[PDB]
């Protein structure tokens, strides 16, 4: 699974997990087993206006 | 007092009941001893432990 977030939200993106984006956007199970990449996409997401 | 030995048995009967009964109302580490105010003030991750 592949997305783009916030910066404050990646802690959110973990099982067990209550906030903003978790409850209403994207809910992981309580018993998950994988792995979580996440880095900063600044260079690309980003525009001056 | 000549039939303590009938009144004993129901006597350690009782206590070990009340005893056992009396046992719910313990906290053994947690932070409340009654799983209705863990339930439904914390989130899963540690209200399970």
Not at chain 1, 36 to 42: E, G, K, R, T
Not at chain 2, 10 to 23: G, R
Not at chain 2, 28 to 34: D, K, L, P, Q, Y
Request: aromatic share 6%.
């Amino acid at each position: 699974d592949s997305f783009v977030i916030r910066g404050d939200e990646v802690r959110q993106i973990a099982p067990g997990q209550t906030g903003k984006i978790a409850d209403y956007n994207y809910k992981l199970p309580d018993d998950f087993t994988g792995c979580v990449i996440a880095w900063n996409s600044n260079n690309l997401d980003s525009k001056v206006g | 007092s000549a039939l303590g030995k009938l009144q004993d048995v129901v006597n350690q009967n009782a206590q070990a009941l009340n005893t056992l009964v009396k046992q719910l109302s313990s906290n053994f580490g947690a932070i409340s001893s009654v799983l209705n105010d863990i339930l439904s003030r914390l989130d899963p991750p540690e209200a399970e432990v």
